[PDB]
Design a protein around this ligand. Structure first.
Ligand SMILES: [Cl-]
Ligand SMILES: [Cl-]
Lengths: 124, 123
């Protein structure tokens, strides 16, 4: 079952007329493999469920795309004494992610070291 | 203008010779516009400075790429604490992002509502 079909089943189950709902798919969704498609499904289910539950909401906009991003990933074998990033370091990369329409994660890895990932779409 | 060698300057001023460093550039980095190139440079600088400040670090692996990601974006104009930002909400997002080798952000938007974005590479 294609990714789009799977995500639309989730939307069909959860969307309600009280939130005016728009869904836009762009890009080659058909090439997404089953494991990744499954993760996207789980995420959308959470995001749509929580939107519908969000007090006094009147609208819901869903955009799912496969598109070129820039990605910066940095892995080191150390861990920061005071957290995975300084306060103003988190602020900076988070603000840039927000500005770029992208996403940012930093973590102390389950079995040692630090991972940082930052991605944003090539276009807007 | 040349993005690979520009990001090398960031790495060279911080990582070398302090850390055993690997660097990979994948995809058409020449198509990255000036604004996004500036973000990538600033992110790398922060990420590399952070790694170098870790007392027990000996090694560093850098990957900068242009490649296809799946992106799921969901925006609503509801009020109060979104389910997305609760302990269990964030846990599920973080787990899936980690499993997929991706990333996510949840914003409460100052002007009202909640934005969620989750992305991960196709490969
Ligand atoms: Cl599809
Ligand atoms: Cl190129």
């Amino acid at each position: 079952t294609g990714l789009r079909h799977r995500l639309d089943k989730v939307i069909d189950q959860l969307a309600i007329p009280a939130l005016h709902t728009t869904v836009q798919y762009t890009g080659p969704l058909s090439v997404v493999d089953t494991v990744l498609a499954n993760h996207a499904e789980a995420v959308l289910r959470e995001a749509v469920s929580n939107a519908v539950r969000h007090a006094n909401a009147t609208s819901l906009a869903i955009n799912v795309s496969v598109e070129d991003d820039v990605r910066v990933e940095v892995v080191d074998d150390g861990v920061g004494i005071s957290g995975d990033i300084t306060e103003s370091g988190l602020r900076n990369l988070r603000q840039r992610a927000d500005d770029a329409g992208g996403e940012f994660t930093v973590e102390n890895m389950p079995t040692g070291g630090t991972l940082l990932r930052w991605s944003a779409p090539l276009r807007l």
